[PDB]
Design a protein around this ligand. Structure first.
Ligand SMILES: [Zn+2]
Ligand SMILES: [Zn+2]
Ligand SMILES: [Zn+2]
Ligand SMILES: [Zn+2]
Ligand SMILES: [Zn+2]
Ligand SMILES: [Zn+2]
Ligand SMILES: [Zn+2]
Ligand SMILES: [Zn+2]
Ligand SMILES: [Zn+2]
Ligand SMILES: [Zn+2]
Ligand SMILES: [Zn+2]
Lengths: 210, 210, 201, 209
């Protein structure tokens, strides 16, 4: 087979709720591991209709589906080191927004982020990496410079500031995103994941998530 | 002792992925490395044994389909696993800072991005916004495929995996030097949405498949 | 200054060039000495890197007249976009000129890729990939001549700048900025107006 | 029209021509060569430039003028602060590999707004918006590395930025780095002085003479 991926998507409130609920089962050590059976997997072959895009860090400890106790076909996932944006990232999120009509973008940071740490070391010490790793650090550095100017001092302040700045760039660069937000068909949420206890902590959002 | 780095070779890293995918295929996943206790030990740092560079598609959830847990794979995902400078820096971060022994390029069937590039080339149907930037980067795979006489969409998906492998090697001396040194391998895989098999298509560097 | 006077100066400059009577203005030792103070150009030229399409020469301008961005086949990436926005927002140039030309090796290479599957390696592929949708779009509309894709590519470049840059699109809406799309002819040296958004007189 | 085929010039002769060129410019005796009606008609055949200049977009740093060249002499890539993105890299590689240019000039200059803006970001946390931030982000590492090495004066950061741009091109492009090892290409770091119009050699990889 049936095609179930046509027709309208859900709303930002229902989409956020399901992610909230899922991270709660994960936190409590009670994951249901849903939407992953052999039969569910086989029915996904004709198309996808995820209810969210997670734009997360590539960090191996921040596996988005696991941490929000989702399965297959639930979330479109874009992941780069320190969730930095280039034109392929931006096109990836726009595909989900404009073709899959996802009602929710989650920008997902976390503590002990090596991309945020590298940008701190660059600014404090002039320690810069080489090759394309420098391109990642380049894109994080402004978050740290803007935080510094606002009197931020703690790593966790910079990590949170980086999520907010990522939200801000998505908004400024993409009329696809900002026009759907204005229209009320899309919300964007800034979240930090806590490696200690596995809580996904809402910090920021544009649009109604309930 | 406390060791730094994954302390594993490409053969073993690949073996664990193959075995995890068999568990998933069989509908017998372990859901390993995601208990509250194991999770708590990860706040200390990450030692993943591979970087997965996969499609953003909600049905190709890399950790689930290889039946891995937290701390196991650094994950980079864009639509059609297209590359640009943040993508490349992210993969290079895992290769050079985390010293991962394996890069897995994960394509799959029913890829929207490959489909969009085929429509671009067949009809001159092009998306707008930054989604076009994704399609632009897939289009060469289709053109080179067409030139070699491929016609089937599964063939283009497979060709695109191969072209992505080749781009990583061409643009990143960090990657190509470690492959030459024997400390790194790269594997191209197609995931079958039907049955969940991650199918081996391509590799450079010894992964124990000889 | 203003978009109308900016484009007038450029068109007249190109006429001096076409006639083989260049002034070579604004390049004296003394004028140059005064530029060390600051720059206040009247236009940004986004042109091709081609050695034969030297923008200051073909518009018969001098030093401090035009901010110049040049990539193979006037393809855009973020550094390009950022450069144009610098002239637009920091220098307040009233005019953007998208400068294409005939016998463009990038449009040609994009032609060869779409017709043959002939593609370059390295970063040249990244240039061609960016020109390819111009060729695909023009082909969908029954374009067949090489000079025609060249023009279509100038139009697409104009459209991309408008769509990607609210700094540009807002100023064009407010009337302080105009974007002009032009094709340079290698043979007679004429810079030919093909496209524009905003009032250019 | 004709279309000519053949080997391009060598790194020593290409640098000599520009060196001599800028001397005419400095001296206020511009010959404005390779711009005649007839010469222009000749170039319809094909371009055969002897150099790629990768320069700043700054309207005061007009490359053909300051080096007193004409049409068909130099392939020209310009971005604000001569920052590199993949279109820039692809542009330079087209010149290097297809046009076989024996010389790449990375052209910085004094009073560079891109370098200025990067200094203001690291010192004050002053960051521009939109895509201008992408330019400043790419210069910022040259300033951080400068500061670490004890540089203070603005001119020293401008020069350190030219050096970092040369190093990125060498590191990102195997097409470039192989040709420099083969001896068929050279890369030069130059700083243009707005004051006297002088283009000053700073660093170089390959033999320029
Ligand atoms: Zn049904
Ligand atoms: Zn259907
Ligand atoms: Zn991180
Ligand atoms: Zn915010
Ligand atoms: Zn330790
Ligand atoms: Zn896909
Ligand atoms: Zn051209
Ligand atoms: Zn002849
Ligand atoms: Zn020929
Ligand atoms: Zn400058
Ligand atoms: Zn140097």
């Amino acid at each position: 087979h049936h095609h179930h991926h046509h027709g309208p998507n859900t709303n930002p409130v229902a989409a956020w709720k399901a992610l909230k609920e899922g991270n709660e089962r994960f936190v409590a050590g009670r994951p249901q591991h849903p939407s992953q059976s052999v039969d569910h997997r086989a029915g996904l072959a004709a198309g996808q209709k995820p209810t969210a895009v997670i734009f997360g860090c590539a960090d191996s400890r921040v596996a988005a589906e696991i941490i929000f106790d989702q399965g297959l076909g639930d979330m479109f996932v874009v992941r780069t080191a320190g969730h930095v944006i280039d034109s392929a990232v931006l096109g990836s999120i726009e595909y989900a927004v404009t073709v899959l009509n996802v009602p929710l973008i989650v920008v997902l940071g976390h503590d002990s982020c090596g991309a945020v740490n590298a940008a701190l070391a660059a600014i404090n010490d002039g320690t810069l990496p080489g090759g394309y790793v420098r391109d990642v650090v380049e894109r994080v550095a402004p978050s740290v410079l803007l935080g510094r100017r606002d009197g931020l001092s703690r790593v966790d302040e910079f990590e949170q500031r980086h999520v907010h700045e990522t939200v801000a760039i998505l908004m400024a660069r993409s009329s696809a995103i900002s026009e759907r937000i204005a229209g009320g068909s899309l919300a964007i949420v800034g979240v930090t994941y806590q490696l200690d206890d596995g809580r996904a902590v809402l910090r920021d959002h544009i649009g109604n998530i309930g």
